[model samples]
Target: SLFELGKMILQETGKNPAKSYGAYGCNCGVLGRGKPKDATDRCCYVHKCCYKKLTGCDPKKDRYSYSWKDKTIVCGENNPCLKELCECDKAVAICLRENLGTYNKKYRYHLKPFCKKADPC
Candidate 1:
């Protein structure tokens, strides 16, 4: 799994990996409240936009919808929507794992002041 692969890479290298993209973090969820806790959370922000672009899934409606559970149940099926959603999640999981140093423990609960100007795009 790419998620495990990210963890293995992190285990092998004791350094935090940098994101290749210029896009940064946002408070990613239905409410879209607060600020990103860290870089891993930023990955989630990207994932939310990915869903909108690839699968037409509403970030506000489906951000915390727990669709991964359904994705797992229908893993073998050839559903394009789920496939894209899974891929988005897979990428974010890798990103989160790679940047675990940023939010592994210290900053996971730490949130910046709510900023309405923050944009995930």
Candidate 2:
């Protein structure tokens, strides 16, 4: 699963305290107001770019569909685009969970101002 794969990457990168792939923070305004409030938000930024760089998936359509209410929603196994989207999202979700400690620390300290917003890609 992509989530597991992301965790493996995270381990390999030592969690990349500052950035990932040379970019950081929440890049999309609609998702994170263009500012990453914390590490979890940064994951969303990466997820957005992953979809944007892909040919068949659009973040606008594939994102915002996963929720507690729709926990049963599953991606089609044969649809490559959907599979890619699912993998990207699952990786992001794993990132979010893995970075919960960072998020909590930032929240506790009111560290929103320290978050670095990503440049336009």
Candidate 3:
């Protein structure tokens, strides 16, 4: 796993790794790194896999939607985070494999500062 690789690397540098951290920190699915138009740094396996999620996202013509368990992403009528994730016009990352900002994993803060650095591209 990418997290494991990151942990091993950190440990080798005389650092004690408390946990792993990266692009998908809040259960937010990853996207970047490949021959991708948006990979801003090193070529990592995780990044390539992340970028692959957005196989075909044509900004001009694509309908995006989602249904949550409660369905209401936010209890309030106006939610910036929910709106950003669900709105097609607010797109930063678009992937065909799943909903924007959606993922299969649930991530929490397993890593602390100093021990492991965040690799958000």
Candidate 4:
């Protein structure tokens, strides 16, 4: 696991690990280390997968309709986040994925941020 790789290497060289952290905490796997051991950056991976699954929009189309000028909001209303996710329109829906923070594990957070509620893109 990435947890001990660095420490082990350091110890092998007569050094000690003074501090360490988890994948998310330290960005080991998430940042690009190993697989299972450092797989903390799953947030975006999960979010994008689910967003495309639910909406039908490929974020890469227009950079996921993402723009630093907007806020993230839910596409659950009549407008629905689906529109943005599938339609590829930043005006109607922000391309950025969200945690949604629910029981749905497939649904995760996008790499960027978007419009919140009715804030305006």
Q: Which candidate is the best by lDDT?
A: 2
lDDT of each: 0.46, 0.50, 0.29, 0.27
Question: What range of 10 consecutive residues in model 4 has the weakest lDDT sum?
Answer: 91-100
RMSD of each: 9.3, 9.7, 15.3, 17.5
lDDT of 3 by residue, 22-98 (tens): 44342222332222212211222233434334434432233334332342222121344333323322122222122
The 10-residue segment of model 1 with minimum total lDDT is 59-68
* Candidate 3 minimal-lDDT segment of 10 residues: 89-98
Report clashes for each candidate as comma-separated counts.
Answer: 0, 0, 0, 12
User: What lDDT is reached at residue 73 by model 1?
Assistant: 20
- Candidate 4, residue 49: the lDDT equals 38
Of 2 and 4, the candidate ranking higher by lDDT: 2
Q: What does candidate 2's lDDT look like per residue over 16-114, in tens digits?
A: 433342233433223343455667666767777777666765544543223322532344445676667766766665675577566543233233455
Q: Model 4 reaches what TM-score against the true structure?
A: 0.24
Cα lDDT for residue 12, model 1? 32
- 47-110, model 4: which lDDT tens digit per residue? 3333444543233332222222233322232334444443322221111112112213221232
